[PDB]
Design a protein around this ligand. Structure first.
Ligand SMILES: [Br-]
Lengths: 109, 4
């Protein structure tokens, strides 16, 4: 497994019951968010760790056909059956780098 | 997707 891209972002999940975003893992702050590629089965996943204490706040697969939504210039999002993930990037450049890596990953799947 |  190899990191193909990384960006700084505050990782959020959507609390549908209350119609609100909450910090992934319980506390607000920036994480280093990677896309990892695993050879052999050709899989990708997003893995993010809090800069402060290395808490893993996101670890989710990227399936073929995932719909990655660039809601704003610095907030991007996607879903699975259980929850909706959001990345609040530290800059538009961080967001564009991550998005381009994600979209190219979806082309390799 | 939900809004921000
Ligand atoms: Br492969």
């Amino acid at each position: 497994e190899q990191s193909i891209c990384q960006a700084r972002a505050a990782v959020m999940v959507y609390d549908d019951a209350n119609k609100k975003w909450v910090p992934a893992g319980g506390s607000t702050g920036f994480s280093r968010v990677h896309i990892y590629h695993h050879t052999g089965n050709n899989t990708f996943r997003v893995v993010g760790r809090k800069i402060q204490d290395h808490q893993v706040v996101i670890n989710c697969a990227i399936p073929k056909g995932l719909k990655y939504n660039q809601a704003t210039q610095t907030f991007h999002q996607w879903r699975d059956a259980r929850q909706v993930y959001g990345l609040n990037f530290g800059s538009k450049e961080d967001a564009n780098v991550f998005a381009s890596a994600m979209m190219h990953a979806l082309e390799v799947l | 997707x939900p809004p921000x």
